[PDB]
């Protein structure tokens, strides 16, 4: 196999990690296992500390001359690598013990556990005015040498490693989306009926969506246009529940429904990133440093209806709107989830 390693710029402190992406299984997420290598003489009675942090960030320490760069913590954990803490967790993982065998006595295992309620890795798309990075939630692992956690030492003898928390498509088919809305008229018994339904609950990235629409226009009013769109809802909750919604895909058909007639059609719509690079504030999947990534996957939540998820939650819905003459339009919304298939 292989294992990732990174070292301090002084080249004395090195941290080993077996993975970069840790998958959340909705009951437990992969524990962060690794060892840190440091010469016991360079420390000189100093202590090696490793911290795991996930935080809202608007631009990292990229040395960019731009001023503003916010940072709001969401979770903080600490671990004393050297000298060793009490036994629990008593058994080191197989990766940890193999790394200790490979490196020797100068390596020290460190263990982390990510709580269930923590958010996934989501990156907001930077706008034209924003340079470098933009807002997003990301995970971080830092190793440093100090006498105590609060000591302000020479912070150049530290190594920072970016890791990711990800989710994959659940291995079960959900209920088929469907929604009906009948527009009643007070002046008579005429009523305009609109139906819309998808074919699956879950769709992969790049997989087309088929929407079946049935219209029963039993009224004198004429439908002028039919619009089918996919919207992304991002729930940014850090101090107040702020929601940002942005359309990610649209299809327009000039399908006029004549009065006292029935209409049925199937539309194919596929959300992707090429047509919507310009949309500032669009939720994207967590990047490592800068590499291109697709649209943000939906964030499924624990079935226990847990709250206070302090991060970014992204969901997708399909909106079908009927353009009716003399106003009085009717709309239907169908929610679906967008995910990646579980790797083999």
């Amino acid at each position, epitope marked *: 196999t*292989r294992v990732f390693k990174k070292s301090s710029p002084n080249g004395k402190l090195t941290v080993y990690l077996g993975k970069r992406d840790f998958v959340d299984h909705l009951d437990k997420v992969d524990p962060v296992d690794g060892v840190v290598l440091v010469d016991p003489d360079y420390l000189k009675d100093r202590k090696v500390f490793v911290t795991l942090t996930v935080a809202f960030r608007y631009g990292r320490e990229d040395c960019d001359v731009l001023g503003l760069s916010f940072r709001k913590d969401l979770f903080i954990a600490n671990y004393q690598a050297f000298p060793p803490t009490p036994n629990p967790p008593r058994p080191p993982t197989r990766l940890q013990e193999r790394l200790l065998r490979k490196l020797g006595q100068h390596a020290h295992p460190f263990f982390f556990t990510i709580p269930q309620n923590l958010p996934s890795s989501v990156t907001l798309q930077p706008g034209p005015e924003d340079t470098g990075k933009a807002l997003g939630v990301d995970f971080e692992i830092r190793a440093f040498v100090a006498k105590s956690l609060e000591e302000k030492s020479h912070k150049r003898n530290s190594v920072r490693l970016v890791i990711r928390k990800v989710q994959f498509a659940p291995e079960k088919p959900g209920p088929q989306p469907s929604a009906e809305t009948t527009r009643h008229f007070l002046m008579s018994d005429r009523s305009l009926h609109l139906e819309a339904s998808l074919d699956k609950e879950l769709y*992969y*990235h*790049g*997989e*087309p969506l088929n929407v079946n629409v049935h219209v029963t226009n039993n009224s004198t009013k004429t439908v002028k246009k039919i619009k089918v769109s996919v919207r992304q809802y991002a729930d940014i909750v850090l101090f107040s529940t702020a929601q940002y919604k942005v359309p990610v895909a649209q299809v327009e058909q000039d399908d006029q429904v004549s009065p006292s007639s029935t209409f049925s059609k199937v539309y194919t719509i*596929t959300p*992707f*990133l*090429a*047509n919507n*690079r310009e949309k500032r504030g669009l939720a994207l999947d967590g990047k490592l440093k800068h590499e*291109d990534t*697709n649209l943000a996957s939906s964030t499924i939540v624990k079935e226990g209806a847990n709250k206070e998820v302090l991060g970014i939650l992204v969901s997708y819905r399909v909106k079908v709107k009927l353009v009716v003459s003399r106003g009085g339009d009717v709309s239907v919304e169908l929610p679906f989830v967008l995910m*990646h298939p579980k790797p083999h």
Partner: antibody
Amino acid sequence: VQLVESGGGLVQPGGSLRLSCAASGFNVYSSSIHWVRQAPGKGLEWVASISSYYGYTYYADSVKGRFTISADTSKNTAYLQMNSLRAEDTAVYYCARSRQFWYSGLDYWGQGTLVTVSS
Amino acid sequence: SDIQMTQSPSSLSASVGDRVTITCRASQSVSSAVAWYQQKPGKAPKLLIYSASSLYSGVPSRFSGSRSGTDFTLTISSLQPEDFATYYCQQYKYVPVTFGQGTKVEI
């Protein structure tokens, strides 16, 4: 799943030729399309690729500017517009497919179309 | 710079039931992003192993692949009577993707 390309034949040097690879069985946004040519005797050689999801097209240095690859979503088809054909452009051209998320080799290949250049 | 994949030997011959191995040396590290393809004479190549160790679906288990640093080897346990072909080594860590020179396995 299938991949059929057509548009072979002989083109005089300095000419042009367009080849269309018709894709069936997979979406164009969940897969990437690549063109790999194999000169008679010489092994394989990557030519160009297109990613409809990200809207990015890549070309080898030997065909940079000369060749253009494009695709349309409606017909699930990609094209390779070759211009300024030279004597070293003769080869059997295969249009290959790769998974978009994520690249794991060129699993599906076309039947193989032959392009010749001579005076 | 560009990555040069060197594959040896250029050709080899072994009777049915023998064991052969083909190596592929990368000029620069490719982080195990190596794929192996098999081409029958006058036909399109078929993917055999991706990620330098993961066997493609439908490929018989006799085909094997391993990584040792910057060296990648493709191994066949027992050469079937239909196993003669030209085998290519490809890396896809960096653009452009480069192929091997081929190894004609004869009967």
